């Protein structure tokens, strides 16, 4: 049959996706893209013709993106994360090519050829590329030194040429000097697609990678960085640091969550609870890849393309924190409040409507207009016949991608603790943390 | 105990079909790429067919395209090969194997669980040195050269200890380093096109045919032609 | 009378700022907007030739640009606020696109005329739009049917020519290949102001709208989306998602809020209580509609354009916080602290400055220099005859906006509490919750 | 040290990274863009020929880019930072221009030279830049003025050196339609190099900065801003807001942090501690300027930009947190809980590495592999023999700078408290604020 | 409970002048925009001027530009009409009418609080069914037919009931929603460039005039004709 | 207590050499940008050397590019100056200042706390107002006047107080501004090239030279030619 599935829980006003695919980047490949410059002398033949005067301006446009260039090198849960130096393995590469030769050994693997792979001082090996020759165009094309002297150009058809391959040049530094000599994401300047296709393919990676890669290269581009390098010799180099999606292809769920409250009359004396774990959860070799900070996985059909080091990584056993949220095991995470506020919160096929106080809350859709009025509390509405969900003044267009919702029918957590001594401010604590806070103040109670 | 066991082997007549089954167990299956290697009677350890772990990204060795198909049912814990139009080429020990992969600047799969093999007879590259022999307490080396694909592309190399009757076992994962079991006396190299493993002090259990193993961008993962370390006395 | 106020409370070292007029984005109403495409097959004569080459290279930019698309298509208090998709509604058009009949349908509405509604198989009557005459210039002007294929072309004013209508399709293709397929803001490219001011026009909005969105163009730009969505049959296509400003005109008025400590002198021993409620505030139904992410809203002069989606609908008495905090009524919202530390907070019309320790605070101006030294405690500086206002080493500019502000005197509130029972460590809580917690530790007094 | 150094805490799981060197944006200077406009009838000989239809296209592309800037103006701890306008006097300034003789003033200043300061009303000194001569490109030498106005163009060249001319006022009007009239960084559009190091080299600031901006100039252009201001008489004007580096070359640290726990082995029952005073800090005016947000700022070798508005101003006391974390003097922040979940903080010079429960965690270099396998607990790998730190299934690529690390050996303090009376939930709370709580629940411990 | 009362009505002679004012009351009249419909003495229902609700954008029917000014002073909680150079035409019921409109895929607004009128004598589109019939208990449909603008541009279709004393009350918004006190009988649709109302089991109480209601790309606000519906003895 | 105390000055034969230290205590060292500016013994205030606080920007005066050469020892909270190749136009008492600047729409630095002098003998612009008189109570004022650069160029004007053996002492900083202990008596401004200190009822302890300061884009920052005021019975 067909692809994704969600369900509901009642119980703890949540829901999730499951059968997704996952897309973990691990590693990071490096890869050194070169452009081959000309050095030229400022004294090219000092005329004033119509077109000689627009090369001319073209030169400039030029020698001073090299300089340009050249002046640019000069010597809820997210927070529990942990944080990382992104772009190390690339500048390390970056920085391994500022010793002696590192860059002729380039120059000189890639004359003959416009690839190729090199190994490093440091042994790395390393894919090439030479993706502009503009000291062959310059050196041999332009210096017309038999007729006659770039004093007096003939054609109209070269002074295009010319700044038809310039232009990618001059894209390129203006990139980085906004940017700081590091881009992301990789543009269409950097690397072309059937430069990116091309490089995907000679990586050091497996097939199951590469056609991941290849279908979804609008992806790669956004996980990759452009880090402009060094300037010297003839060589422009800058170094493009691919992603390595080590992990592909097992079973992704997207968990959502919103507040469950008591629905008591009084403006006051309400307690809430809400899951703290929202999020993506991929599973990754015995254990849970966990995505906190759920908007920066970036999805592409099933598959869910994450970043490794926006995770924690946890016991395959916090799968059941959806299914019994109180069993022994794992020991699920919540945050307590007496704001009873309304709110909803859109699932992969559904809604979830949050709805309190004297707030209203509807689900309505584009034909038979308003479809239903929600009763206070947290309920759940499957994105089949509801387009729209409104809560208060706020309209919700649900997502109307296609698959089975299931609703599990339970009784709401927050109905078990007794009012009277339930932690009202506690922003990222445990369910077990508060049965502790519970088991004191009960104790705190000592009588005559 | 993390296992698998094979089953459905036995004798074919050629043009026929055979359907083998690997069972895995001990671990959460979904999660890991698996792969059919074989063996042929007497030696070389070469790749079959791999699938991907939700079984979307499935690849077929030239040995085999059109006439093996891989699958895998992950409910039931289990992997399935189906064989077609069988050859007298094809007569081996069909190894079940658990990938995995291990990123420095490299995405090379290598196995780190194998079954036990299941026997089938049908009836009716990258070189190394083929014979190393060393006294006991000595010290004796492998070499494993490959080309401008594979290792000298960038991937990563393995190593495998076959015993004489065993399935290979893991000795050593991305150039140097050593499984749970595997005892500080192994040790080995990546350099350019090729690798080298390195033996101190020969035992008894060290007497084995020994595999290095790689990824080719064409060939689609690659093993030596084996090594046969042999201990004196 | 005039247009723009103010008014800051010394009691609760906050100030608001009244007389802006709303803007809120309640829906959002999707739009097609075409591009047509020649679909050649890649053999222009490889002529030998001076401007085929030149030809060729244009030809490929756009042959190029088409295949990328191709493979682009393939099968405090802002956490309160529940979270929904943006683009379900532009997506779920885009969805309906692929439908059978559904194209072709539009290919034919709009090949007599620019613009025409039509509608779609689910009824809902969409605004389309052809943008872009591409494939009438290489199919009727380039490659024609009749003479004779071009092996060798005539003038240079058809490779100018040429590359200037094929400009618009490579920027557009360029800005989606960037963003995995979703733009914002929809830019120049992907709308012109001319063709933007168009479709506003025909929207199904009122004039109230019309001209809101008129006016203020580059705003509208920002809350806009722009989807790329097929690309099949001889038609490019992608969704404008623009934004239905659903109310329009209330007063909105902004809570600013500063830390406000006791002026101990001790280095330690100061209590501290700082306003959580801050962000805009339109009203909008009888209710309020509360934004607390400044992000959220943009304005040009009084309009304050909020997007609902980030908003919480709140009872009209949470102005209640502003006159009296510790009315019966609303239940304002605070946190507390023992972290007196130093800093300002600039406001519309003024700026509010928490000096505290041994902190320097003046405020200067730009030609008498200094004209006030704030002492320990939380002030509030109007922009009259001020222009920056200095706390510790960070210098602020203040708002040269003009405007009537009135400083509304009273103690501050924290000299009401026992600093020996006041809770330190409190994040989000309110007024009551905190009176909870001392009531609490006065009954804990009781000895014997 | 002689360069760049790092000391980690053992007993604090915190390192500091020192030998950075200031270069704080304290102020704001702003300087006057202008370009100068042809304000044409649109009678270009309006016939019908080869390169006219050329001419009339990018006439009609540059009025329209006029009249669309015109229709655009109309009728943890980063939470105790405080908020400010961030282009008030950009925008001050703005508002000055549009008073009655200013324009004019600016315009004669301008007609003998490109540069030029000039006092406005207010007496501010504004320095003003015409970087491009459009008025005087269309009224000499677009509409030639002995035969005809140009009635039926001779040559190409002149579509393109006009096209060329004009694709700046383009590029501009395209960035301000986009980002609502104001922009940052500051573009090559908007400011070409030759012209923001002319701006430098000309501002009323000193050599320290003329040096400091001239040499990183890729980061001058991420703090600043554009602001589009005004279009009348015949001048196009937008404020260039630079930033004034104030304090410049004082010493700078970095504080990273991660969090401590007890490493007993039961599911739960562990107790955490994190250093919340992560950031960076320069010391400015024997003060410390605080940094929280440590992506505020951008580095450069050993030059630290950071924004004084997003900095708390501390005592120098503060660095005791790093010494000795329990003085009476400075009272230092942490966070706790009893979230003991692994991860690593990569530092300047090398790793922490907080491993806990079944938590793998390893370090490996590029050749010999893995060289540490950690125990649980907080500990740190310098980054000299090490290139990869994995924790979980997240791989670290680690810095590779150049310096010296020093261990400094300690009880981790989180060793020190008794955790059946150890606060568990404290989101923000200090040192002392914590061990008030233990002082007194452990005083609750009374008989009778 | 909102209210609001028109004032103000009386005679005039022909090129005359006279000033509507309208008090509300019960919700705050800020947050609302503002509108006057007037309806001849025994015909339709025409709209004639908008307010938004902090007199930014304020808009005429043709009828009236230049002869009315619309205006409001919040403060008082009142709008205010003042009509110059009136006309014989002029005469009718001026209704003052709050107005709402939500914003789903398109936004039309609603008039869903009405005054009871102030009368003016002055002396000295979208058709609909012109009526229907039906017993106690049968069904009824009235069709509301619209064009290519307003219905067909993608506005909606609201849906009044004026019984014979009273002003037009709210019985349909948003095409098919029944506001609060409106029975499970009365329902509607939409179907590009047309509506209809459908009355399921009719009561005595049914019998009034029932217009369709929606908003024009360049008319601005329309009523339908008018049904008016009996019911049989 | 912020203090500055040079030492190492004395007598030299031209061509000579010597090596002044600047000790500072008080303040933290490291923080501050260190400055040197010599006084001829009867004749003016004017600038020698700059040299940011971690030695990392250093910049000289023109009299003296190439025989002087500033440097500091942030560890021992120490400023020193080698003077080589002396002349007899070196002759004067050479100061010790610490550099502030106040970033509003100019960063123009001025010294607001500076050494006591060491005087080094040698042997073998801004142009203001020279000479002022009043009486006690009077009002008096001091014309400062500069040019394209510097001033107006959109630097700010500073003022010293020179009592007559003594040091100069910090008066107004940014145009208009009195540190901490000078009282309102003095007054200044800053307008277009030019500025004026302003002295309201003299006192007999305002004796004194009276120098504005300001930085110049090429001179590399300024003092004016000074102002000798003298208080009458």
């Known amino acids: 049959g067909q692809n994704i599935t969600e369900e509901f829980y009642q119980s703890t006003c949540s829901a999730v996706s499951k059968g997704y695919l996952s897309a973990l980047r691990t590693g990071w490949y490096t890869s050194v893209i070169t452009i081959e410059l000309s050095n030229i002398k400022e004294n090219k033949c000092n005329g004033t013709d119509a077109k000689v005067k627009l090369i001319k301006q073209e030169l400039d446009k030029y020698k001073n993106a090299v300089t340009e260039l050249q002046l640019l090198m000069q010597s809820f849960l997210g927070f529990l994360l942990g944080v990382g130096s992104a772009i190390a393995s690339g500048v390390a590469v970056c920085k391994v090519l500022h010793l002696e030769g590192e860059v002729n050994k380039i120059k000189s693997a890639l004359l003959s050829t416009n690839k190729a792979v090199v190994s490093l001082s440091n042994g790395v090996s390393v894919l090439t590329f030479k993706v502009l020759d503009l000291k062959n165009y310059i050196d041999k094309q332009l210096l017309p030194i038999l007729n006659k002297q770039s004093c007096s150009i003939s054609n109209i058809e070269t002074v295009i040429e010319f700044q038809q391959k310039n232009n990618r040049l001059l894209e390129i530094t203006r990139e980085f000097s906004v940017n700081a000599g590091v881009t992301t994401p990789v543009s269409t300047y950097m690397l072309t697609n059937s430069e990116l296709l091309s490089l995907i393919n000679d990586m050091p990676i497996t097939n199951d990678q590469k056609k991941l890669m290849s279908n979804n290269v609008q992806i790669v581009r956004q996980q990759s960085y452009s880090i402009m390098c060094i300037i010297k010799e003839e060589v422009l180099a800058y170094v493009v640091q691919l992603p390595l999606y080590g992990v592909i292809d097992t079973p992704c769920w997207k968990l959502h969550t919103s507040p469950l409250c008591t629905t008591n009359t009084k403006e006051g004396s309400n307690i809430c609870l809400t899951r703290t774990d929202r999020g993506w959860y991929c599973d990754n070799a015995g254990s849970v890849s966990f995505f906190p900070q759920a908007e920066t996985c970036k999805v592409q059909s099933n598959r869910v393309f994450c970043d490794t080091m926006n995770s924690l990584t946890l016991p395959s056993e916090v799968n059941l924190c959806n299914v019994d949220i109180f069993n022994p095991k794992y020991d699920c995470k919540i945050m307590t409040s007496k704001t009873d506020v309304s709110s909803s919160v859109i699932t992969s096929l559904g809604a979830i409507v949050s709805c ?22 947290c309920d759940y509405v499957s994105n089949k016949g509801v387009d729209t969900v409104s809560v208060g003044n706020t309209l919700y267009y649900v997502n109307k991608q296609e698959g089975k919702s299931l609703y599990v029918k339970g009784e709401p957590i927050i109905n078990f603790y007794d009012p009277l001594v339930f932690p009202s401010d506690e922003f990222d604590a445990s369910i077990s943390q508060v049965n502790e806070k519970i088991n004191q103040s009960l104790a705190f109670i000592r009588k005559s | 105990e993390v296992q698998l066991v094979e089953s459905g082997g036995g004798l074919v007549k050629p043009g026929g079909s055979l359907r083998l089954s690997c069972a895995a167990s001990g671990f959460t299956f979904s999660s890991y790429s698996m792969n059919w290697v074989r063996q042929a009677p007497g030696k070389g350890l070469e790749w079959v067919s791999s699938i991907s772990s939700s079984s979307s990204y499935i690849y077929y060795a030239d040995s085999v395209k059109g006439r093996f198909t891989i699958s895998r049912d992950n409910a039931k814990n289990s992997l399935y090969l189906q064989m077609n139009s069988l050859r007298a080429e094809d007569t081996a020990v069909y ?28 009836s009716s590259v990258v070189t190394q040195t083929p014979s190393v022999s060393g006294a006991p307490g000595q010290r004796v080396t492998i070499s494993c050269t490959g080309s401008s ?42 350099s350019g096109t090729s690798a080298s493993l390195a033996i101190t002090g020969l035992q008894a259990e060290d007497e084995a045919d020994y595999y290095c193993q790689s990824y080719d961008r064409s060939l689609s993962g690659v093993f030596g032609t084996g090594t046969k370390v042999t201990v004196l006395g």
């Open chain 2, 95 to 122: 190894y079940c194997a658990r990938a995995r992969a291990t990123g420095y600047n490299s995405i090379t799969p290598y196995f780190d669980i194998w079954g036990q093999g299941t026997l089938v007879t049908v």
């Open chain 1, 356 to 377: 309190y106080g004297k707030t209203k809350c509807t689900a309505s859709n584009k034909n038979r207009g308003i479809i239903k009025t929600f009763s206070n509390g």
């Open chain 2, 149 to 190: 694909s594979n290792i000298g592309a960038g991937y990563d190399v393995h190593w495998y200890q076959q015993l004489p009757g065993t399935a290979p076992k893991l000795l050593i994962y991305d150039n140097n380093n050593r499984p749970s079991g595997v005892p500080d006396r192994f040790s080995a190299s990546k």
